[PDB]
Amino acid sequence: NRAQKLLHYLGHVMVNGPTTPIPVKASPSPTDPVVPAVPIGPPPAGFRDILLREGPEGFARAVRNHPGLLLMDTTFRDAHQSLLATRVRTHDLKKIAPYVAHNFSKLFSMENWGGATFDVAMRFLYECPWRRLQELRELIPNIPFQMLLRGANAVGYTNYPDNVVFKFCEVAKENGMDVFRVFDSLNYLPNMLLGMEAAGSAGGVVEAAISYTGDVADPSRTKYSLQYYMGLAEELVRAGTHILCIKDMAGLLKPTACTMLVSSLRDRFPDLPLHIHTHDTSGAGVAAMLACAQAGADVVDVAADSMSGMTSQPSMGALVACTRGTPLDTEVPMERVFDYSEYWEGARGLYAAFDCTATMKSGNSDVYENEIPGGQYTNLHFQAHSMGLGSKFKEVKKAYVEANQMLGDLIKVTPSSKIVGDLAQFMVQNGLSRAEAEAQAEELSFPRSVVEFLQGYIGVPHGGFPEPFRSKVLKDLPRVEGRPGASLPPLDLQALEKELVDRHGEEVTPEDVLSAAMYPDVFAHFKDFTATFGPLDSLNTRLFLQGPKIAEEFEVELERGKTLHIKALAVSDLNRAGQRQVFFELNGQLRSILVKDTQAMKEMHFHPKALKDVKGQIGAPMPGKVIDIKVVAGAKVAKGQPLCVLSAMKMETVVTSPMEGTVRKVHVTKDMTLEGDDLILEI
Amino acid sequence: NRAQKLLHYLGHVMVNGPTTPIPVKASPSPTDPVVPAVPIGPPPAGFRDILLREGPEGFARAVRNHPGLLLMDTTFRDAHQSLLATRVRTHDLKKIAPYVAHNFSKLFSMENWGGATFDVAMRFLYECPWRRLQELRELIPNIPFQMLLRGANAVGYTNYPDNVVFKFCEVAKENGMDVFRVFDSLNYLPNMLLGMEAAGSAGGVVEAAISYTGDVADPSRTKYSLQYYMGLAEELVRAGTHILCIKDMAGLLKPTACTMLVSSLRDRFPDLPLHIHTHDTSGAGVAAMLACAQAGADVVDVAADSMSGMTSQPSMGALVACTRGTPLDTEVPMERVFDYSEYWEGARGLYAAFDCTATMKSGNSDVYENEIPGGQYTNLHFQAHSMGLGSKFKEVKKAYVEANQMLGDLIKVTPSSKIVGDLAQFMVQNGLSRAEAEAQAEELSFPRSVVEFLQGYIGVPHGGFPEPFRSKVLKDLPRVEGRPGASLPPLDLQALEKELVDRHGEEVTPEDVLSAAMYPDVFAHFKDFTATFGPLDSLNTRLFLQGPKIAEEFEVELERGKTLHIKALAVSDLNRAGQRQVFFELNGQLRSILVKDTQAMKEMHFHPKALKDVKGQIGAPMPGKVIDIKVVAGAKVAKGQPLCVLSAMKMETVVTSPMEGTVRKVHVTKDMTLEGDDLILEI
Ligand SMILES: *C(=O)CCCC[C@@H]1SC[C@@H]2NC(=O)N[C@@H]21
Ligand SMILES: *C(=O)CCCC[C@@H]1SC[C@@H]2NC(=O)N[C@@H]21
């Protein structure tokens, strides 16, 4: 009963379309991604060998004592979150993972988990994220792995109790995660210290990421000054971080600001490794990374050349070529870069339904005025499409700016940017301005994320909440102040394990109860879907998003040894219950799949009958047209008296009543062409 | 391997259409024929009981001593030969045979075999005629059967040797035939005596049928006078016939001529039974039959009221009603007639593709000027449709009159009418008049039936052949005079049995070798078809001519006990070899049928290549357009010299020759937009 669920999925996708929401109506390309040649044998030695040999402090001293620029690949997580709405599957990553393991041994790390990959992998792709992590950990053994962990937000959207995040880092380090980049939205310091403690006690390398916004080189803006970042970095180094990081999530770091900030961090902490992360939204990413690498940055984040650009990271080939021959040489050969970007061009062609290039064709300097991050940009375009706002995204960006100013000049990264984007979609859908919605603040019903933020369930912003808005929206809802994670009670995780073993099965693991603690309803619907259709992980992307075509024999190997040569021969028409039939040739023998179509129902309405059991139910003895009614609705009549007269083709009849009674209502109007045995009078 | 051939037939009819030629593009009606209620038990006693009890002479004395008019039903043979091109199957006859056996016990006989039913049952319907005869002989035991046998023509179209017709009557009497109506086309007397001897020595009742033509009441026409019929009847009574018959095959008997001829035959032979057969083409059939029954006729031929009329027999209900209360009472109840005609209205609705009423909506008095018989009328319309003359049938009838006059005023019945109709289609297809084709008689190529008739292989006409035409068409072909059947050698029938057992199987019976003696190639193609698709006899007519529809469960019971509930679920698209696939649900399990489509082939042509193995094969290195040729076809050139120049999108190339040689031909013309690697010069 394994190929039957797969054929049910394939027929359901053929007849009804894909169960994924599709924002751009397009098909996957017929061209396959070209995987290059990989030398057979064990891969080279990398930085994970020195990590497992001498710990995180020796890893930090090795990355600090490396002559030249080090790179981190973000193609597996942040490139397709910025460009393809986080929709790239584990199949296309596993096809290129041995090439990366053989040829990119000199990388610092590789971000391939965390962010929005958790929620999208369970929600839209029907995959387990721990399964992707384990598969790529077997495939790439020589390069350290890196995950993007929020403060007390783990991989969710709100603050969690401490035991859940500690257990989350414990199990993620158990599965294979090496480097943990911990950041917070509002730069709220105890949430950062909590996330750093949870990441450090699990045994992993800690990368304390400071969220950057504004401009430190512009003295006109004084809220997030250079001294603000210097004090934040001083306290984060005082908590025992191993690598400091600057997360510029919108792409706002300019070369002068880069030189100023990295030189301040280098002459304040002379032996601490600096990592810079930026997006190339404004079009100045490679220039900013060259400014950082000359100012004293150690690791910078890149992506493959076909998977970089618009809202993504800077390009790997441009960073390799722009440092060739310099003292900052990365000594990576460019031909391996060419083959890797060749693969990702072929693989990006498969995801044309979620692609950024259907709307945005080049960069945009207006990110200097709306400050939207890139992953949020593509996921926000999808979310605005799925709520009817799919043709008003410029107004969503304008209300984005308005909602940033209205909520008190927040630092927008994931959670806070999700709050500002929810408020922007609310202000677009209800036509409200800034002052127009602050005047009606005590009347309107803001969404759960905005009201939950104004309560303070994610933390406290810099300079405090907007207190007139917080007084007008929150009437008497509880304002839990201080730290949200030090107030909420710990979830009994063995109770949740006991709650989940009696619903799905007995292969429920701690990874599953962490998936259900982070997302209860998404894990429930994911488990129901994978009960119905089974492991759709090992399908290719054209099969997953499009199904097969007629008379084209395709090969599916679900598990080890179990191979299936499947043809799709015909699709019938609809049955009595609105169901179609699909005919397959599975392993050479004919099989049949019955799938419910989803559009051919809910089309019926007509006039009711005249029920014969009651003599006071006067109906039409013959069809035609009501030409005159002789009764007043409310009086009573005798039997034999005329009530209504009807006419048909050369025929006219007068309706008589069979017995007495009070005329309740005249059910028929004037000149209503009714059928036979249809009710004209209730009596 | 029995349901597979049936499903192959059903899928072949679904995808490709019916293998029958269809003259009128229409579908069988969704209404089923309403079979009435039949009382359970043994049927009444009829005339076959007195036949089997006292022989043909006692049968003749019983039909001669019956007070009142006797009827013969022609609905099973002559009605659908006149109206539906002989296409009614054994299924629809078997559905009403027990009703006839229970309710029409007072019939004289029932014509249900012979005529064109043999050739059409093997050729277009894929049935054995002996199978129909045996099935209806089990179903109707109380009524004598009647067959229409030609002279020395048996059930064919030319004269046969004596042993074949004697064996034919032997086996037909063995199978269940009781009454044999023997007639000849030219009223050639020794062929009539041969057919009467073959029918009488087998042990059956002999009905000597005189073919009627012209008008005995009109003294202006003197060729077929009343004395001619009187002398013919005198010699046919002198040969020992049991029942005399007048076959008016075109419908030319008028009431005065009927009274004159039947009164002459009654006062010449006072104790011999007279049978009259007519068609209702002119619209005076019931009046003529009432005139015959009052003049002294004993049996008249009728048909069911929904299966009578236009070119068919007179109506049974009109004959029953017009003799009610008279001394000529038939004592048949009219309600049984109503139910029988109700069945045949429902069953005639199934044969809408072969129906007379698509062209002819009422009778026609022009049969007084063209003299076409009714069965020939419908079969001739089919034959003119299958030879491209389907829209020129009025010209076929005009050339019919011309070919009657041109061939010497023949008596037109089956063979002779087939000769005149072949000549009429020849004169329509070649635009010839009468004298225009007799002037070119020595030049043209008349068909095999006309030339074979002018040789005299069917017999000698009254007054001799047209001797200028017989001299001009026949140059030196052998004119076998006298009797054709007393000249030809007898066929070795055991040799033909030995020839047929080593081709099809070992269930080859004498009925099969008579079928192959009468029609060799039709029996061969019929045996190949029934080897491929099996016994298609037990299908209903909508299934046979139309196939099934999608998602409509139909029941087929091929043989005793073996029942099949078949659904048809889907039909795919075409394969590589142009074949479609049909999906069935046979007995509840899914089956697949692969049928060759017949239209999606024979579409390819383009320019040939330039073959690389020869250096003297100069072809186009790039596509484009020939703009100038610099060579003269015939001279020889050196290598490096320009030959042709070609242009494409912003590109122009000059063709050089690789070596020397003589330019044979310039293969390309001016401004021929050719492809790449396409030949421009042979050298
Ligand atoms: C669900 O659609 C997955 C994307 C949801 C929003 C994600 S979470 C990370 C990015 N930051 C943000 O505010 N939106 C993006
Ligand atoms: C074949 O199509 C069966 C009909 C062929 C002609 C038949 S034979 C009897 C009728 N008489 C005649 O001349 N044509 C009809």
Ligand nearest to the CA of A78: 1
Best residue among B111, B279, B379, B410 to mutate for probing ligand 2's pocket (most ligand atoms within 8 Å of CB) is B379
User: Which element (helix H / strand E) includes B149?
Assistant: strand B145-150
Task: Please tell me the distance from the alpha carbon of residue A68 to that of residue A106, in angstroms, as a whole number.
Answer: 11
CB within 8 Å: B570 and A575: no
Determine contact: A603 vs chain B, CB below 8 A.
Answer: no
The radius of gyration of chain A from alpha carbons, rounded to an integer in Å, stands at: 32
Query: Number of A:B CB contacts under 8 A?
Result: 34
**Is the CB of B583 inside 8 Å of chain A's CB atoms?**
yes
Q: Ligand 1 within 6 A of A250 CB?
A: no
Distance CA A348, CA A365 (A): 25
Q: Which two tokens stand for residue A528?
A: 């129901």
What is the distance, to the nearest Å, from the Cα of residue A5 to the centroid of all Cα atoms in its chain? 26
Cβ <8 Å between B551 and A583 = no
Cα-based angle B651, B655, B660 (whole degrees, multiple of 5): 170
Half-sphere exposure in the Cβ direction for A155 (13 Å, CA): 26
Asked whether the beta carbons of residue A550 and residue B571 sit closer than 8 angstroms, the reply is no
Q: In what order do the strands lie in the sheet with A589-596?
A: A554-557, A563-571, A579-586, A589-596
Paired tokens of B281: 């083409």
Q: Is A105 in the pocket of ligand 1 (CB under 6 A)?
A: no
Which atom of ligand 2 is found nearest the CA of B421? 13
Cα–Cα distance measured from residue A414 to residue A371, given in angstroms and rounded to the nearest whole number: 12
Instruction: Confirm or reject: Cβ of A414 under 6 Å from ligand 1.
Output: yes
CB B14 less than 6 A from any atom of ligand 2: no
Indicate which atom in ligand 1 lies nearest the CA of residue A157. 8
Among B469, B467, B407, residue whose Cα is nearest residue B438: B469
Residue of B nearest to A574 (CA): B551
Report the DSSP pairing between strands A110-114 and A145-150: parallel
Ligand nearest, relative to CA of residue B400? 2
First-residue to last-residue Cα distance in chain A:
61
**A581 and B575 in contact by Cβ < 8 A?**
no
Asked if B134 and B93 count as a contact pair (C-beta separation under 8 A), the reply is no
**Pairing of the two strands A145-150 and A179-183:** parallel
Nearest listed ligand to the Cα of residue B379: 2
B263 touches chain A (CB under 8 A): no
For residue B577, which residues of chain A lie inside 8 Å, CB to CB? none
Q: Cα dist. B392→B21, B396, B414, B654 in Å?
A: 18, 6, 22, 61
In this structure, are residues A292 and A263 in contact, taking their beta carbons and an 8 Å threshold?
no
A182's enclosing H/E stretch is: strand A179-183
Please count the other Cβ atoms lying within 10 Å of the Cβ belonging to residue B292: 26
Q: How far apart are the C-alpha atoms of A155 and A149, rounded to whole Å?
A: 6
Beta pairing partners, B592: B583
N-term to C-term CA, chain B: 61
The protein residue with its alpha carbon nearest to ligand 2, atom 1, reads B120
Element at B596 (helix H, strand E): strand B589-596
Burial category of A360 from C-beta neighbours within 10 Å (exposed 0-12, middle 13-18, buried 19 and up): middle
Helix (H) / strand (E) element for A56: namely helix A47-64
CB contact under 8 A, B572 and A592: no
Tokens representing B304? 């069911």
List binding-site positions of A: 77-81, 150, 247, 277, 279, 414
Q: Is A388 left (phi over 0), alpha (psi -120 to 50) or beta?
A: left
CA of A485 relative to ligand 1 center, distance in Å: 22
- Tell whether B552 lies on the interface with A, counting CB pairs under 8 A: no
Interface check A577 vs B, CB under 8 A: no
Question: Ligand 2 in contact with B515 (CB < 6 A)?
Answer: no
Query: Is B573 in Cβ contact with A583 (below 8 Å)?
Result: no
Please indicate whether, in this complex, the C-beta atoms of A569 and B590 are within 8 angstroms of each other.
no
The answer to whether residue A575 neighbours chain B at the CB level (below 8 Å) is yes
Q: A198 near A167, Cβ under 8 Å?
A: no
Q: How far apart (Å, rounded) are the C-alpha atoms in residues B54 and A277? A: 118
CA B375 from centroid of its chain's CA atoms:
9
- Chain A contacts of B551, Cβ < 8 Å? 572-573, 575
In DSSP notation, A150-177 reads: ESTTTTSSS---HHHHHHHHHHHHHHT-
Q: Of the bound ligands, which one is closest to the alpha carbon of residue B372?
A: 2
How far lies B63's CA from each of B58, B72, B182, B328, in Å? 9, 12, 19, 14
From the list B550, B571, B590, which residue is nearest A590 (CB)? B590
The token pair that represents B109 in the structure block = 């006989």
A375 CA closest ligand 1 atom index: 10
Copy the structure tokens of residue B490. Answer: 């007898």
Query: For B609, how many CA atoms within 13 A lie in the half-sphere containing its CB?
Result: 4
Q: What phi and psi values does residue B64 have, to the nearest 5 degrees?
A: -75, -25
Which H or E run contains A451?
helix A448-455
Query: Which of B260, B229, B256 is CA-nearest to residue B245?
Result: B229
CA distance B240 to B207: 10
Q: Which DSSP symbol is given to A609?
A: B
CB contact at 8 A, A96 and A340: yes
* Whether B575 and A551 lie within 8 Å, measured CB to CB: yes
In chain A, how long is the greatest CA-to-CA distance? 113
**Alpha carbon B653 to chain centroid, angstroms:** 68
What single letter denotes the amino acid at residue A5? K
User: Token digits for B591?
Assistant: 């089956």
List, in sequence order, every residue forming a beta bridge with A646; answer none if it has no partner.
Answer: A626, A653
Q: Do A581 and B569 touch (CB under 8 A)?
A: yes
Asked if the C-beta of B570 comes within 8 angstroms of chain A's C-beta atoms, the answer is yes
CB contact at 8 A, A83 and A355? yes
- Assign A374 to helix, strand or coil: helix
3-state secondary structure B391-453: CCHHHHHHHHHHHHHHCCCCCCCCHHHHHHHHHHHHHHHCCCCHHHHHHCCCCCCCCHHHHHH
Please give the distance, rounded to the nearest whole angstrom, from the Cα atom of residue A345 to the centre of ligand 1. 24
Give the tokens for residue B477: 């072909």
CA of B364 to the centre of ligand 2 (A): 20
B108 touches B138 (CB < 8 A)? no
Contacts of A579-588 with CB under 8 Å at 24 or more apart are A580/A15, A581/B569, A581/B570, A582/A7, A582/A10, A582/A11, A582/A14, A582/A15, A583/B569, A583/B570, A583/B572, A583/B583, A583/B590, A584/A7, A584/A10, A584/A11, A585/A553, A586/A3, A586/A7, A587/A3
| B-chain residues near A573 (CB < 8 A) | 550-551, 570
Give me the residue from B551, B572, B590 closest to A592, CB to CB: B590
Query: With an 8 Å Cβ cutoff, are A583 and B570 in contact?
Result: yes
- For the CA of B415, the closest atom of ligand 2 is 13
Kindly identify which residue of chain A lies nearest to residue B574, measuring between CA atoms: A551
**How much distance in Å is there from the Cα of A24 to the middle of ligand 1?**
18
State the DSSP string of B330-356: ----HHHHHHHHHHHHHHHGGGGGG-G
Nearest to A165 by CA among A459, A518, A414: A518
- Which H/E stretch holds residue B681? strand B679-682
